């Protein structure tokens, strides 16, 4: 019983939702393809790109070493082992590199072993050194060339945008006042004239044939001293390329920055030729400038962009066009392209190591596989994946998370001029790029906008760059519409008519403005290419999960757009009543669940592995159980199917993490009345009905993972044993079987989680002691306890234990580190005071009190409510539509239904009524049957609701009811005392999640203990644990008041000042008197610390001459 | 007047509208509620306390051949409502399951002074390797109690379960005014004392009043 | 509502902080070594409720402020001999134990 | 060591009104589920006795004024409502008559000094009349529990009556908070406290038990049943 609301839908949010990657990587990691085709980008390019390495003597002797087809191959280990043995899920990659001679000699070193190129899981992420990580797609200034106003004082500047931040230099032509036209490549400012001279141009042939209509020239001529002769030119320019290199015309160096596709090349143009052409005086080719022709160079883009400059420095072709952040200028390098460039580096180093081994060694013995030392492609490559501001863990709390995190787009990339946390130009970018296919209500706080998420139907097709959404054009296809697309307007969703949408006023967007109604009304190619396949594409895949976004105010609407990431799978995943089709797909691209393949059949046994689909072949399917989430989410799978066939409108074949039967199910939906409850729901706190705990609802299960390494340090070998000295206390093996704790064991705080003794030789057990020791059989001792034990965090039930030991197979551990015990501990948490509940409309809040069914607000027939969300502020203050969920609530509770009211299309107030209107003729249709009907309490109200001109007067009480049900809802008694709540109190089933933020993990308390031995102030330790921070802000706090003493105490008897510390604990343990300080250590020490530098810090008293007695002990 | 008319459309364990009658204008709740309040709280009942399963060292497990998942079980078993037919005591049902079947709470070994109010009650869909031998407590009790009332017993894998005692499952009450007496002003009660596990409304209602009385009593001698 | 006569005290001495000192030194004088420094002892004794029953409370300042608001005591530049101000304590049962 | 299964009922007794009552440790949930119904019945169902209709020679309707009387009708009317009579214990439900003299303060005693019905509140302005102090009242008094406005109807002296309202109920205010304490370790155990205000004859505490009785007296109604399968 599912009700849906809506209109059209020509496509689907598209497969899969993890295509940004997945289908990306592969096509960059070609490999899978027969080693013939596949021509560029990805690994191959990097290869071809690194030009066959030569060496001294250009075409004189032996050694050429040309590269060929590479070979990703026989994958060392397997996912799972990798994480178990902390290993990057890599794979070998070698490529035969036949070197040459100049006395004929063809040698092909088969394969030639090489780097380990990390593979990507079916998922769309990586396993690196055990943990799971994700490569987040960055965006930057699209390659090209496009000036921009000189931010200084009015005077447009010219920028040249090389392809990727590692395939060309950022060149800015800057026309100034004192210096004029400058060519500043990387770290070098110089007369722009000079390079031109080299390129041929020159006084007259140059300006006065270029820059006339707009002065800006004499300054370019003056240094004509440079414009007096090329060749000699380079040399002076070369001389202007630090350090003191050898002035000797070489052409090389410039053998780049234009010459050949080496460190400059937008490749076969595409976004360089295909762009500068339609920006400059047309005409161009593969790169900038062109040499190696037969002599002098032949520029292609160095004056025309200078021309087009001046032009916009005083002429008509303005186009001040700054980065213009137009997604027709904002590129996005998908993982594959981030991992590719890195190869475009591993090699950059190999080529060196190769050219070098070339020489030295015997030209007859100098063969490859002996010339190639596979260190570059690794290192620098395995360097990236786990050490990049762009490679990150993985939000794995609830599945939406993971999936979501891949759709995310970082701009905090580490590229060139790539916005630093506050890089040069920040609180400008942030803002909504008028390009809608990279959501507007997602981001967080502080990183406000430098990290956005990309829209649903966004991208998918011939991709050279930038998102590009899908946009209908009258039936048929939907065209992967570019981002620099005008295509004669666009007509927004709605106002249709079979196939001719009869609106004759159709609303549309064109270039920007919502521009009223172009009205082409051609019914033909959708008024050009107008029309958007559904709205969805306007927003983030994980926002579209909001039943009433419409009403929901952007800002707050984002506070739910995120928050709901921080779900936290439970046991009763519950899909939401009002959900939005998406709920059903998000959890099917996450692969967090187990699908099917062909037709039906089953066989199975059910439990640990939905057994073989049984379809023709035979394949068993194991079910991950009580795993561990990067966030400690405990994502397990559930077996759904007994003994049947394929699918029943969906082959869920057993759910996943936080998904009710196939539908994404973050939290639980429950019934709630709105209304201020004696303060317990003050500001934002939600009061809660004990029931939710009694019915094991919000209960979430988390499994931790404690660790211990067995060192070797010079005192004796560190060993993992169950013979912890003295720890006899019938504890040891009262648990800890032959060393480490046992499964199913139950762990409180303090118990030995994984014991291990240690030698340490503090002092020598001198006589007497050794004697007395012998005497009273006081067996001498040499080993310390140094066990593991569980921290002040309660603990839980020992779920499992892994153990890695040096010499083991695929492992490998930190030098010195031998063996490494690991132990997982579960936990099931229910719900307590503290913790957040936050719904889909950013109505976030933390539980305050939890009433017993007894109290609470009894509905009329006795059913208690669930949460007591306060109406104050929250709604008004936040203006949202978390009400149009609570209304289609009972109108779905009683009518017993789950609904689909998608974003910007459905579930309308009248329908919400129609429905609600109904589902009453039963709610109440019953009462007038069970044998009851409206009592003194309900009348007492109704006859006052109309006073509130809230219900139609004249009508019968019964009549006033239904009337007062569509809107709010029944009198709603206060099961606490007994009377009614004067004034109805809208009641309903919302849907509250339980954000990975339970109180437990927070809240600690100190008093003493873990005192430090480096800074001498409470931090780190063993037994107790604790320690609280007292920042500066609080210093002023006390300064501002007058609690001088109260302040001192925080820089005396409570931290560094030992005398004091002890004084304190001695003072209390006794009683009567208090912590008595005097001269804080902080002072006695500052003196005898400045002295050490040759200063005589004197402490003169009241009269200057009463010179202190200080430190006189 | 001088007294009402305590009607009582009863039932068969659960459902128990118990109508007083010409209660003077007001007391419609002075009585109506507390009972209802009390009837949802302080009242003796039956509830599981701990379960032990064949080869299950502790919760967060997974019994082979069984479709389910050990927690579900305990979550399901959390319901199973027993009856005791006896004065003071706790006890331990016991059930072993075979190959392909559907161990619904019913298959819970018949035994002594005990009834299984809620037979059926799909306890576990085991199959192919129907192995399930279990041992669940079931203590007398009152109210709600979780991790505290330790389910020791089979000192080992008790995986103690939650205590959900209160045999009452819902309680409301109307004040419908359509009676005689002396002038159309007074009210007319009718508390329902809805569903239950073992005990019957009348009993809940009855047991209820007692308490309210004993407390009412406490108002004795003051200092 | 707050401190019994907190306002009343703020009247007695001058500088708001001055008092904080007096009560402080006083508390740090009263149930600090002796207890036989009281002035409230009679029918006006700060007694604490606690299951079993009543009985004074171990909160120095508590008695302090309310002993001050009493009448005795004095403050400023008197008893010049701080030395003889704490030694005079020897003149009448002091010390404790450890 | 200080509560067990027997709360400690503690009163305050002031003398005729305000008398704080406070039983102590009680399982969480009875402060309400108990301390409330009393406060309810307390405000209602309680035998009481107060004026209810007044004949005072001349001008019927309560709206008007009389010469040689500093006040007006209604002021006496209400000034009357603050009268406290005590009908010994027979069955009583009589009338009363005041003897107004010249220029003096007509107390709430200048009535027919009839025994068997004493006046707790001797004073009470009632009304002022100077010089030609006329004034003759045959102020009645009835017997009731709840509250009754212009609904009963002042039959008595057929003509002329200005019936006042039935403010008959000994208690005049009933409040109650339920702060929680834990003299019994467990930091959250209900703790009533009552503040019954009464001056309309019957003492406070007396009002309480009476009601407490009125409630059990009532509770017994749920005894012998008459079902239906
Ligand atoms: Mg906050």
Swiss-Prot record, chain A:
Molecular function GO labels: DNA binding; DNA-directed RNA polymerase activity; ribonucleoside binding
Keywords: DNA-directed RNA polymerase, Nucleotidyltransferase, Transcription, Transferase
EC number(s) from the headed UniProt entry: 2.7.7.6
GO BP annotations listed: DNA-templated transcription
Gene Ontology cellular component annotations, sorted alphabetically: DNA-directed RNA polymerase complex
Catalytic reaction equation(s): RNA(n) + a ribonucleoside 5'-triphosphate = RNA(n+1) + diphosphate
Complex and partners: The RNAP catalytic core consists of 2 alpha, 1 beta, 1 beta' and 1 omega subunit. When a sigma factor is associated with the core the holoenzyme is formed, which can initiate transcription.
Xref: HAMAP family: RNApol_bact_RpoB
Record function comment: DNA-dependent RNA polymerase catalyzes the transcription of DNA into RNA using the four ribonucleoside triphosphates as substrates.
Protein name in the entry: DNA-directed RNA polymerase subunit beta
Originating organism: Thermus aquaticus
Record lineage: Bacteria, Thermotogati, Deinococcota, Deinococci, Thermales
Gene name per UniProt: rpoB
Curated annotation (Swiss-Prot), chain B:
GO cellular component: cytoplasm; DNA-directed RNA polymerase complex
Membrane spanning stretches: none
Tree of life domain: Bacteria
Keyword set, alphabetical order: DNA-directed RNA polymerase, Nucleotidyltransferase, Transcription, Transferase
Enzyme class: transferase
Region Alpha N-terminal domain (alpha-NTD): start-end pairs: 1-223
A Gene Ontology molecular function term of the record: DNA binding
EC number: 2.7.7.6
Reactions mediated catalytically: RNA(n) + a ribonucleoside 5'-triphosphate = RNA(n+1) + diphosphate
Gene Ontology biological process: DNA-templated transcription
Domain note: The N-terminal domain is essential for RNAP assembly and basal transcription, whereas the C-terminal domain is involved in interaction with transcriptional regulators and with upstream promoter elements.
Similarity comment text for this entry: Belongs to the RNA polymerase alpha chain family.
Purpose of the protein: DNA-dependent RNA polymerase catalyzes the transcription of DNA into RNA using the four ribonucleoside triphosphates as substrates.
Subunit structure, interactors included: Homodimer. The RNAP catalytic core consists of 2 alpha, 1 beta, 1 beta' and 1 omega subunit. When a sigma factor is associated with the core the holoenzyme is formed, which can initiate transcription.
The protein's name in its UniProt record: DNA-directed RNA polymerase subunit alpha
Organism of origin: Thermus aquaticus
Gene name, Swiss-Prot/TrEMBL: rpoA
Residues of the whole record sequence present: 6 to 229 of 314
UniProtKB/Swiss-Prot annotation, chain C:
EC number: 2.7.7.6
Origin superkingdom: Bacteria
Catalytic activity: RNA(n) + a ribonucleoside 5'-triphosphate = RNA(n+1) + diphosphate
Keywords: DNA-directed RNA polymerase, Nucleotidyltransferase, Transcription, Transferase
Keyword flag Nucleotidyltransferase: yes
Function: Promotes RNA polymerase assembly. Latches the N- and C-terminal regions of the beta' subunit thereby facilitating its interaction with the beta and alpha subunits.
Annotated protein name in UniProt: DNA-directed RNA polymerase subunit omega
GO CC annotations, alphabetized: DNA-directed RNA polymerase complex
Organism: Thermus aquaticus
Annotated Pfam families: RNA_pol_Rpb6
Enzyme class, spelled out: transferase
Swiss-Prot record, chain D:
Reactions catalysed: RNA(n) + a ribonucleoside 5'-triphosphate = RNA(n+1) + diphosphate
Region named Alpha N-terminal domain (alpha-NTD): 1-226
GO molecular function: DNA binding; DNA-directed RNA polymerase activity; protein dimerization activity
Record keywords, A-Z: DNA-directed RNA polymerase, Nucleotidyltransferase, Transcription, Transferase
Superkingdom of origin: Bacteria
Part of the whole protein covered: 3 to 232 of 314
Family the UniProt entry places it in: Belongs to the RNA polymerase alpha chain family.
Organism expressing this protein natively: Thermus aquaticus
A Gene Ontology BP annotation from the UniProt entry: DNA-templated transcription
Protein name: DNA-directed RNA polymerase subunit alpha
Subunit: Homodimer. The RNAP catalytic core consists of 2 alpha, 1 beta, 1 beta' and 1 omega subunit. When a sigma factor is associated with the core the holoenzyme is formed, which can initiate transcription.
Lineage of the organism: Bacteria, Thermotogati, Deinococcota, Deinococci, Thermales
């Amino acid at each position: 019983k599912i009700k849906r609301f809506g209109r059209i839908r020509e496509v689907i949010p598209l497969p899969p939702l993890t295509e940004i990657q997945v289908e990306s990587y592969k096509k960059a990691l070609q490999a899978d393809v027969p080693p013939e085709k596949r021509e560029n980008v990805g690994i191959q390019a990097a290869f071809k790109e690194t030009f066959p390495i030569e060496e001294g003597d250009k075409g004189k002797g032996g050694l050429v070493l040309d590269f060929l087809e590479y070979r990703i191959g026989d994958p060392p280990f397997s996912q799972d082992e990798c994480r178990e043995k902390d290993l990057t899920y890599q794979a070998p990659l070698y490529a035969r590199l036949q070197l040459i001679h100049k006395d004929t000699g063809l040698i092909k070193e088969d394969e030639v072993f090489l780097g380990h190129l990390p593979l990507m899981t079916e998922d769309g992420s990586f396993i690196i050194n055990g943990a799971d990580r994700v490569i987040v797609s960055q965006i930057h200034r699209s390659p090209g060339v496009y000036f921009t106003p000189d931010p200084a004082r009015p005077g447009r500047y010219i920028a040249s945008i090389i392809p990727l931040p590692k395939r060309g230099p950022w060149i800015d032509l800057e026309v100034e006042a004192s210096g004029v036209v400058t060519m500043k490549v990387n770290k070098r400012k110089f007369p722009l004239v000079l390079l031109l001279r080299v390129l041929g141009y020159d006084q007259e042939t140059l300006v006065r044939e270029l820059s006339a209509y707009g002065d800006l020239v004499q300054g370019l001529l003056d240094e004509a001293v440079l414009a007096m002769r090329p060749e000699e030119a380079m040399v002076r320019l070369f001389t202007l390329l630090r350090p003191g290199d050898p002035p000797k015309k070489d052409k090389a160096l410039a053998y780049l920055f234009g010459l050949l596709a080496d460190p400059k090349r937008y490749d076969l143009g595409e976004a360089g030729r295909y762009k500068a052409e339609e920006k400059l005086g047309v005409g161009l080719s593969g790169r900038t400038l062109v040499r190696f022709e037969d002599g002098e160079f032949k520029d292609e883009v160095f004056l025309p962009t200078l021309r087009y400059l001046f032009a916009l420095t005083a002429g008509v072709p303005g186009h001040e066009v700054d980065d213009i952040d137009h997604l027709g200028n904002r590129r996005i390098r998908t993982v594959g392209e981030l991992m590719a460039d890195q190869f475009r580096v591993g090699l950059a180093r190999l080529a060196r190591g190769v050219r070098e081994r070339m020489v030295m060694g015997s030209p007859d013995t100098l063969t490859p596989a002996k010339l190639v030392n596979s260190r570059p492609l690794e290192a620098a490559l395995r360097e990236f994946f786990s050490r990049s501001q762009l490679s990150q863990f993985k939000d794995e709390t609830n599945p939406l998370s993971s999936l979501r995190h891949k759709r995310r787009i970082s701009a905090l990339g580490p590229g060139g001029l790539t916005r630093e946390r506050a890089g040069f130009d920040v609180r400008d970018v942030h803002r909504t790029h008028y390009g809608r296919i990279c959501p507007v209500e997602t981001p967080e706080g502080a990183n406000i906008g430098l990290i956005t998420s990309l829209a649903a139907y966004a991208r998918v097709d011939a991709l050279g760059f930038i998102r590009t959404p899908y946009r209908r054009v009258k039936n048929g296809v939907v065209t992967e519409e570019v981002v620099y697309m005008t295509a004669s307007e666009e007509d927004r969703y709605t106002i249709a008519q079979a196939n001719t949408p009869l609106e004759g006023d159709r609303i549309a967007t064109d270039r920007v403005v919502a521009r009223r109604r172009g009205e082409p009304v051609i019914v033909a190619p959708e008024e050009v290419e107008f029309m958007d396949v559904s709205p969805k594409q306007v927003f983030s895949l994980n926002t579209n999960l909001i039943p009433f976004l419409e009403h929901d105010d952007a800002n707050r609407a984002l506070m739910g757009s995120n928050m709901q990431t921080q779900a936290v799978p439970l046991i009763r995943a519950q899909a939401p009543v009002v959900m939005t089709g998406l709920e059903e797909r998000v959890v099917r691209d996450s692969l967090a669940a187990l699908y099917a393949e062909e037709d039906g059949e089953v066989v199975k046994v059910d439990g640990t592995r939905i057994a073989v689909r049984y379809e023709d072949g035979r394949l068993v399917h194991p079910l991950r159980r009580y795993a561990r989430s990067n966030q400690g989410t405990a994502f397990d799978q559930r077996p759904r199917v007994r003994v049947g066939q394929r699918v029943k409108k969906g082959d869920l074949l057993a759910d996943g993490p936080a998904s009710e039967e196939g539908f994404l199910a973050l939290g639980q939906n429950v019934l709630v009345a709105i209304m201020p409850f004696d303060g317990y729901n003050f500001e934002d706190a939600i009061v809660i009905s004990e029931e939710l705990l009694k019915r094991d609802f919000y209960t979430s299960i988390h499994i931790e993972r404690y660790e211990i390494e067995a060192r070797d340090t010079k005192l004796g070998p560190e060993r993992i044993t169950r013979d912890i000295p003295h720890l006899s206390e019938a504890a040891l093996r009262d648990l800890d079987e032959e060393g480490i704790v046992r499964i199913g064991a139950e762990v409180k705080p303090g118990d030995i989680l994984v014991g291990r003794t240690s030698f340490k030789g503090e002092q020598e057990p001198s006589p007497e002691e050794r004697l007395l020791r012998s005497i009273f059989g006081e067996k001498a001792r040499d080993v310390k306890d140094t066990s593991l034990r569980v921290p002040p965090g309660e603990g839980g039930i020992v779920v499992g234990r892994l153990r890695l030991r040096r010499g083991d197979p695929g492992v490998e551990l930190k030098p010195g580190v031998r063996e490494v015990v690991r132990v997982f501990v579960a936990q099931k948490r229910k719900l307590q005071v503290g913790d957040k509940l936050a719904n889909r409309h950013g109505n976030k809040g933390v539980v305050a009190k939890i009433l017993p069914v007894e109290d609470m607000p009894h509905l009329p027939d006795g059913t208690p409510v669930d949460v007591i969300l306060n109406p104050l502020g929250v709604p008004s203050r936040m203006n949202l539509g978390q009400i149009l969920e609570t209304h289609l609530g009972l109108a779905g509770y009683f009518l017993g239904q789950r609904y689909i009211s998608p974003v910007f299309d459905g579930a309308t107030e009248p329908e919400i009524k129609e429905l609600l209107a109904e589902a009453f003729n039963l709610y109440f249709g019953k009462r007038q049957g069970e044998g009851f009907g409206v009592d003194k309490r309900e009348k007492e109200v109704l006859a006052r609701a109309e006073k509130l001109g809230l219900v139609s007067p004249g009508k019968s009480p019964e009549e006033q009811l239904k009337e007062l049900f569509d809107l709010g809802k029944v009198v709603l008694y206060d099961g606490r005392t007994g009377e009614p709540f004067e004034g109805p109190i809208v009641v309903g089933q919302m849907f509250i999640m339980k954000l990975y933020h339970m109180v437990e993990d927070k809240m600690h308390a100190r008093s003493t203990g873990p005192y430090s031995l480096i800074t001498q102030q409470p931090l780190g330790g063993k037994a107790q644990f604790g320690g609280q921070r007292f920042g500066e802000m609080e210093v002023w706090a006390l300064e501002a008041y007058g609690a001088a003493h109260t302040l001192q105490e925080m820089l005396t008897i409570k931290s560094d000042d030992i005398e004091g510390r002890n004084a304190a604990y001695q003072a209390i343990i006794k009683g009567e008197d208090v912590p008595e300080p005097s001269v804080p250590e902080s002072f006695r020490v500052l003196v005898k610390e400045l002295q050490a530098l040759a200063l005589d810090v004197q402490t003169l008293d009241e009269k200057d001459n009463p010179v202190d007695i200080f430190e006189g002990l | 007047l001088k007294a009402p008319v305590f009607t009582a459309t009863t039932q068969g364990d659960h459902y128990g509208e118990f109508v007083l009658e010409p209660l003077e204008r007001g007391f419609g709740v002075t009585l109506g509620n507390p009972l209802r309040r009390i009837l949802l709280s302080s009242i003796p009942g039956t509830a599981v306390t701990s379960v032990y399963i064949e080869d299950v060292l502790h919760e967060f497990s997974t019994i082979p051949g069984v479709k389910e998942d050990v927690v579900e079980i305990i979550l399901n078993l959390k319901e199973l409502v027993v009856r005791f037919l006896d004065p003071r005591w706790r006890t331990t049902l016991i059930l072993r399951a075979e190959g392909p079947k559907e161990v619904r709470a019913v298959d819970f070994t018949p035994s002594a002074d005990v009834e299984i109010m809620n037979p059926d009650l799909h306890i576990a869909t085991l199959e192919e390797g129907g192995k399930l031998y279990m041992e669940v407590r079931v203590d007398r009790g009152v109210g709600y109690v979780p991790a505290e009332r330790h389910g020791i017993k089979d000192r080992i894998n008790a995986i103690p379960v939650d205590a959900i005692f209160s045999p009452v499952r819902r309680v409301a009450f109307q004040v419908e005014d359509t009676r005689l007496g002396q002038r159309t002003d007074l009210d007319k009660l009718t508390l329902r004392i809805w569903t239950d596990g073992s005990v019957t409304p009348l009993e809940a209602l009855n047991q209820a009043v007692a308490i309210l009385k004993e407390h009412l009593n406490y108002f004795a001698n003051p200092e | 509502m707050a401190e019994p006569g907190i306002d009343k005290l703020f009247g007695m001495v001058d500088s708001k902080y001055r008092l904080t000192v007096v009560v402080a030194k006083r508390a740090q004088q009263l149930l600090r070594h002796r207890f036989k420094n009281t002035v409230l002892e009679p029918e006006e004794r700060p007694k604490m409720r606690t299951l079993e029953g009543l009985y004074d409370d171990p909160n120095a300042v508590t008695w302090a402020m309310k002993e001050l608001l009493t009448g005795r005591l004095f403050f400023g530049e008197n008893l010049v001999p701080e030395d003889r101000l704490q030694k005079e304590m020897e003149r009448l049962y002091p010390t404790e134990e450890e």
